[PDB]
Structure 1
Amino acid sequence: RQAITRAMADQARTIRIPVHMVEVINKLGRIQRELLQDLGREPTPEELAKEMDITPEKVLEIQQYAREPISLDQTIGDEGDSQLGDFIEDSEAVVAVDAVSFTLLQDQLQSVLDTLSEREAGVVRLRFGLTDGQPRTLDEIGQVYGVTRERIRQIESKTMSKLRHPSRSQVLRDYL
C-alpha cells in the first residue's frame, strides 16, 4: 500500500507534484468533503485554514496547485468539429506591427546618430552596445579611444544634452 500510494502520488498527474504537497492536498480534500457534509453548506477557506492550522493564503496556493489541467482535445464548442485549441488567442505571438515599427525605429535612430559627429556616434554605439549587442563601459571606450573615461563621461553628457532637443527628437518621442 505504500508503493501504491507513492505511485498514485507520483505518476497520476500531468504535472509532477512532490508527495508531501499531494498529501496535504489529500488532507485538504478529505477535510473539505467532511466539512461540506457535516457543516451542511460550503466551507470558507479561512475556516479550512483554521481547521488545518495553516494560513488561508497557503490554502489558496494549495487549491491553486490542486487544479488539474484540462485537455485541448475536447469538442468544447457546439459543433463537433469545433476545437477548443483553436479558440486561444496567442498572446505570446508576433504582434507584427511592432516588429516593423522596431526596424523602422532602428533605421531612424541610425539616421539620428548620423546627424551627429563621429566620436559622438561611436561613444553612444559602444556605450549602449547598439552596434554589436555588448554595452561596453566608458573605460573601454577610452581604451579604444585613447582618452580618459572622465572624457567619455563628458562626451556622454554632451551627447545626452544634444539628444534632448525636442526639435531634434520629436520623431523619437513619437516612437514610444
Structure 2
Amino acid sequence: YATWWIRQAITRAMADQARTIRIPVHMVEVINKLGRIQRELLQDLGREPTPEELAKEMDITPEKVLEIQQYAREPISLDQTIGDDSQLGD
C-alpha cells in the first residue's frame, strides 16, 4: 500500500518543485506522456517521430503537440561560461 502513496508523492513533487517556471501538474503529465510516446515511436520508427505521429498517439490536435512541447522548454542560465571568461549574461 505505501509504495503507491510514496510513488505518488515523489511524482507530484517532481511535477511541482523541479522546474524554474512551474508548469501545473496536468500539463506536466501530458508533457511527460508526450516525451514517453516520442521515445517509444523513436524506438520503433527510428527517426524522431514527426508531430503527426505524436498527435495521433496522443488524441490531441497536432498544434496541441506543438504547444505541449513549447510549454516544456526548460530555461537556461545566464551564468554559463559560453566559451566551454564570458558568461551568457553579458
Specify if TM > 0.5.
yes
Distance in 2 (alpha carbons) for counterparts of 1:32 and 1:64: 15
Unpaired stretches in structure 2, ≥5 consecutive residues: 1-6
Distance in 1 (alpha carbons) for counterparts of 2:9 and 2:77: 28
Query: CA offset at residue 49 of structure 1?
Result: 0.3
Distance in 2 (alpha carbons) for counterparts of 1:72 and 1:31: 32
Contact persistence 1:9–1:18 (CA under 8 A): yes
Query: CA offset at residue 46 of structure 1?
Result: 1.5
Query: CA offset at residue 61 of structure 1?
Result: 0.4
Match of 2:86 among 77, 82, 94: 82
Distance in 2 (alpha carbons) for counterparts of 1:44 and 1:67: 18
Unpaired stretches in structure 1, ≥5 consecutive residues: 86-176
Q: TM-score, normalised by structure 2?
A: 0.87
Contact persistence 1:72–1:84 (CA under 8 A): yes
Query: CA offset at residue 77 of structure 1?
Result: 3.0
Deviations 1:5-35 (A, max 9, x none): 1100000000111100000011000001111
Q: Give the number of aligned pairs.
A: 83
Query: CA offset at residue 40 of structure 1?
Result: 1.3
Contact persistence 1:77–1:84 (CA under 8 A): no
Contact persistence 1:75–1:83 (CA under 8 A): yes
Quote the residue 2:10 is aligned against. 4
Quote the residue 2:26 is aligned against. 20
Deviations 1:91-121 (A, max 9, x none): xxxxxxxxxxxxxxxxxxxxxxxxxxxxxxx
**Runs (4+) of structure 1 moved beyond 4 Å?**
none
Contact persistence 1:49–1:56 (CA under 8 A): yes
Q: Over aligned residue pairs, what C-alpha RMSD do you find?
A: 1.0
Deviations 1:135-163 (A, max 9, x none): xxxxxxxxxxxxxxxxxxxxxxxxxxxxx
Secondary structure at 1:84 match in 2: coil
Deviates more, 1:69-78 or 1:29-38: 69-78
Query: CA offset at residue 53 of structure 1?
Result: 1.0
Larger RCO (CA under 8 A, 6+ residues apart): 2
Contact persistence 1:49–1:59 (CA under 8 A): yes
Distance in 2 (alpha carbons) for counterparts of 1:42 and 1:29: 11
Q: TM-score, normalised by structure 1?
A: 0.46
Deviations 1:25-84 (A, max 9, x none): 110000011111111112110121011011111110010011101101110136xx1121
